[PDB]
Amino acid sequence: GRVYLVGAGPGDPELLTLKAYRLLKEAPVVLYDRLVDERVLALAPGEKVYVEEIHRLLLRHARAHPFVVRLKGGDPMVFGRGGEEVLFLLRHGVPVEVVPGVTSLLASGLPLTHRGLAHGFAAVSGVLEGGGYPDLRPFARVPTLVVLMGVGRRVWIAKELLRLGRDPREPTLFVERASTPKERRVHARLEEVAEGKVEVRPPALWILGEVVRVFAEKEAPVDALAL
Amino acid sequence: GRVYLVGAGPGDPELLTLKAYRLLKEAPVVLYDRLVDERVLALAPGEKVYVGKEEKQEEIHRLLLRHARAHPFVVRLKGGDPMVFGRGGEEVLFLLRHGVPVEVVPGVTSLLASGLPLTHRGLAHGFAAVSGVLEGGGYPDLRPFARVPTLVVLMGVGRRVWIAKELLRLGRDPREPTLFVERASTPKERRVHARLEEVAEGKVEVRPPALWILGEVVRVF
Numbered sequence: 001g002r003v004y005l006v007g008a009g010p011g012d013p014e015l016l017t018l019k020a021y022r023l024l025k026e027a028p029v030v031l032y033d034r035l036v037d038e039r040v041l042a043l044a045p046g047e048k049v050y051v052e053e054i055h056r057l058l059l060r061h062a063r064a065h066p067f068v069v070r071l072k073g074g075d076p077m078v079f080g081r082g083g084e085e086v087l088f089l090l091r092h093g094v095p096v097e098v099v100p101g102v103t104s105l106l107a108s109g110l111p112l113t114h115r116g117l118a119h120g121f122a123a124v125s126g127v128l129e130g131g132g133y134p135d136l137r138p139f140a141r142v143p144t145l146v147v148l149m150g151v152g153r154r155v156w157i158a159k160e161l162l163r164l165g166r167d168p169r170e171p172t173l174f175v176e177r178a179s180t181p182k183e184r185r186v187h188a189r190l191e192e193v194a195e196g197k198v199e200v201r202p203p204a205l206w207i208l209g210e211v212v213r214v215f216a217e218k219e220a221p222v223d224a225l226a227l
Numbered sequence: 228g229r230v231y232l233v234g235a236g237p238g239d240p241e242l243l244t245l246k247a248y249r250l251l252k253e254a255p256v257v258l259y260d261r262l263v264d265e266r267v268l269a270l271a272p273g274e275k276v277y278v279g280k281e282e283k284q285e286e287i288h289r290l291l292l293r294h295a296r297a298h299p300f301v302v303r304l305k306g307g308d309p310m311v312f313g314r315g316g317e318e319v320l321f322l323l324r325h326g327v328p329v330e331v332v333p334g335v336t337s338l339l340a341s342g343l344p345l346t347h348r349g350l351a352h353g354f355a356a357v358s359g360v361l362e363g364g365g366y367p368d369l370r371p372f373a374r375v376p377t378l379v380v381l382m383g384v385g386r387r388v389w390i391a392k393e394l395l396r397l398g399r400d401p402r403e404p405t406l407f408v409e410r411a412s413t414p415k416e417r418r419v420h421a422r423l424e425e426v427a428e429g430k431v432e433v434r435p436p437a438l439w440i441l442g443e444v445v446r447v448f
């Protein structure tokens with residue numbers, strides 16, 4: 001039958017879309033991948049299957065039912081090989097409907113665009129399909145830059161951005177497990193990351209740019225938004 | 228009281244988050260800006276107050292402060308995700324500076340309204356997003372974004388020829404496929420295809436609003 005490629009959001013089940021929620025409650029089968037929060041899965045009463053060899057495993061269930069749900073973290077169309085799964089499915093006649101989600105890029109609550117600091121932003125992956133390194137040159141000077149899958153390679157990424165002209169004193173922020181109870185924010189200047197001084201564990205969202213300090217009190221290092 | 232800065236999604240009410248929906252259904256007052264979809268607004272039973280502008284903002288800030296002080300909580304509804312392309316950062320800053328508690332509720336950003344892949348093996352390993360209209364109606368310095376594999380432009384229909392020309396001036400491929408998704412996330416959604424060249428030449432017809440995606444992913448379909 002039909003495959004609904006659904007964004008699970010960054011983690012907090014409340015950030016599921018109304019559409020995603022209804023499809024999860026109603027789906028006979030939910031093919032999820034690693035990126036999916038336990039709280040969101042617990043909302044699905046149907047068959048939960050942890051899911052190329054991912055593609056064919058998708059095809060089999062799509063055929064077994066009237067429709068199935070293929071659940072991916074954040075929004076399915078960015079940084080998740082969603083495009084690949086869509087192609088494969090369409091090429092095998094399987095209809096596909098995409099249900100956008102709250103991308104993790106937006107899970108920090110910070111204004112990625114802000115008057116006088118950034119009029120746009122860019123997002124890039126530290127790991128490519130195949131395991132390679134990203135070409136950071138087209139991204140090096142965007143005022144606000146967000147990096148996904150950049151924790152393991154943070155030193156190399158930081159050094160490369162410094163080489164490409166980013167400000168070594170630029171404030172940056174790592175948000176580990178954003179949206180969840182284990183969310184831990186790590187503040188560091190770009191140079192401190194390049195110097196291998198920052199401890200961070202994946203998965204983590206990495207935001208670089210002055211917007212990072214937008215809600216910091218003037219009179220002290222206090223995050224006015226959090227408090 | 229508290230202010231919830233809430234993302235309305237790109238248009239389709241079904242793309243509201245559970246959290247945004249819960250808040251909209253219970254808010255005594257909803258302060259919405261111009262780009263919030265009609266269908267979303269109709270779901271809110273409380274007092275609906277237009278607090279927006281078409282590119283003043285200090286006025287908007289004072290209105291937000293006035294309503295927030297008169298209720299246990301209010302909802303400040305914005306199109307897409309409240310924290311990108313809507314001056315949400317300024318609104319939150321002003322409120323925090325006035326001692327008003329604020330909670331941000333992310334949304335499905337308009338950048339993602341077309342359901343098309345912005346990143347794709349071999350074509351784009353990241354993307355950039357920019358607006359054709361800045362704070363105060365200013366024009367954007369496109370130099371930082373000109374070469375990103377996949378570029379998405381919001382509010383770029385009116386100034387599409389200038390934008391395309393700037394992009395060409397800044398090094399972007401003239402033959403690059405682009406796509407306009409007119410009235411994305413609505414029943415009236417329409418798609419227009421064209422190479423960067425055609426836009427720069429004034430050969431493309433699109434009426435606002437529209438989401439504009441540039442890059443080889445457009446032809447991945």
Ligand SMILES: [Cl-]
Binds near residue numbers: 073075076079102
């Ligand atoms: Cl995502």
Ligand SMILES: [Cl-]
Binds near residue numbers: 196197198199
């Ligand atoms: Cl370390």
Ligand SMILES: [Cl-]
Binds near residue numbers: 307308309311337
């Ligand atoms: Cl948005």
